[PDB]
Design a protein around this ligand. Structure first.
Ligand SMILES: COc1ccc(O)c(C(=O)c2ccc(/C=C/[C@@H]3CCCNC[C@H]3NC(=O)c3ccncc3)cc2)c1F
Lengths: 337, 19
């Protein structure tokens, strides 16, 4: 059943993967309202689709800036993977298009805000709260990894909370479809596996490492390896001496010792049993895995929901007007977008 | 404490990924 869900899912992903959707909207179909977040090449805005009156989250990327930083391949990956996937806890792409100056990805709007904001505000989540989120990630990485996708950027910043209090993963900008091995140093310092830092070649197991970081940070209030500068973070990660807060249950600590594990013959998620090594862990024993997938578990936290168009769960950012040039920029580099 | 050191650190805001 788990095996034939993943086989249908792979067949659906692969037809979209080999023939991506292109040019399914235009900028003038949307009213731009407010910036929900930023990145290297631009921003994500709340928009309103004028024809239906539906709200969406539109990513706008400046093509010239992508080229200046040598990240063309990353942004093609983001859109090609997003358009192809389908899972309850992945933010859904509704449309995508490009013009002379920019690339656009219109996603569902997830109004509860970033896990990061609620975590920093609250301080830390209880084990049951953290577990509820962790399960959704476990099931998401099961799906993505079955498609030969590595995510490579798990962190509370990239986990949105939706109106029922469930997770939607965003930010596929570092995601990559790979059988075998890959080498780029990428991700967030605090979330990186040792093998990434040491330029060893790595695979999907880095995402399971990242999950250990996230669980640790959700439950502690702070990450297992931190310092003011990235180079000192790396140094703490390669030593691999994790200190656990005294309030951590003995089961949590044991799970964490198996995810934050430098040795890839011992790291959960990677091994022969696979993801079952995680699902059947004792920390997860109260977890009804099928009920998480079906969204029948009641979330420990529903964010305030102030009607559509409301952004009170997001921080404020400086707005900047979209400029569209009359000449086509970087047409050939972005032709498949 | 570890919590105090984290809260006094320069890394409690949004983290950027590296390339
Ligand atoms: C290799 O570097 C890359 C790769 C791909 C990219 O798209 C980018 C970006 O330029 C870029 C631009 C804006 C953003 C904004 C992301 C925001 C805010 C940062 C924290 N993650 C949450 C994300 N918010 C949403 O996506 C969102 C979606 C749906 N509903 C509400 C919010 C991310 C990447 C990039 F820099």
């Amino acid at each position: 059943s788990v095996k034939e869900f993943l086989a249908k899912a792979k067949e659906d992903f692969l037809k979209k993967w080999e023939n991506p959707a292109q040019n399914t909207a235009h900028l003038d179909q949307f009213e731009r309202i407010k910036t929900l977040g930023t990145g290297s090449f631009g921003r994500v805005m709340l928009v309103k689709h004028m024809e239906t009156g539906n709200h969406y989250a539109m990513k706008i990327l400046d093509k010239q800036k992508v080229v200046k930083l040598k990240q063309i391949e990353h942004t093609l990956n983001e859109k090609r993977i997003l358009q192809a996937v389908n899972f309850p806890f992945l933010v859904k792409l509704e449309f995508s298009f490009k013009d002379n100056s920019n690339l656009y990805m219109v996603m569902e709007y997830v109004p509860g805000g970033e896990m990061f904001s609620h975590l920093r505000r609250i301080g830390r989540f209880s084990e049951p709260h953290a577990r509820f989120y962790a399960a959704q990630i476990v099931l998401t990485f099961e799906y993505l990894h079955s498609l030969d996708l590595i995510y490579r950027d798990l962190k509370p910043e990239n986990l949105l909370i939706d109106q029922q209090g469930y997770i939607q993963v965003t930010d596929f900008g570092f995601a990559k479809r790979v059988k075998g091995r890959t080498w780029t140093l990428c991700g967030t310092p605090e979330y990186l596996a040792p093998e990434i830092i040491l330029s060893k070649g790595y695979n999907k197991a880095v995402d399971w490492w990242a999950l250990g970081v996230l669980i640790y940070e959700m439950a502690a209030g702070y990450p297992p390896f931190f310092a003011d500068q990235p180079i000192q973070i790396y140094e703490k990660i390669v030593s691999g001496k994790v200190r656990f807060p005294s309030h951590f249950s003995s089961d949590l600590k044991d799970l964490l010792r198996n995810l934050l594990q430098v040795d890839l013959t011992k790291r959960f998620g990677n091994l022969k049993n696979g993801v079952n090594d995680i699902k059947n862990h004792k920390w997860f024993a109260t977890t009804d895995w099928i009920a998480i997938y079906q969204r029948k578990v009641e979330a420990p936290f529903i964010p305030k929901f102030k009607g559509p168009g409301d952004t009170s769960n997001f921080d404020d950012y400086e707005e900047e007007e979209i400029r569209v040039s009359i000449n086509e920029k970087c047409g050939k580099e972005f032709s498949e977008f | 404490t570890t919590y105090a050191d984290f809260i006094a650190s320069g890394r409690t805001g949004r983290r950027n990924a590296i390339h």
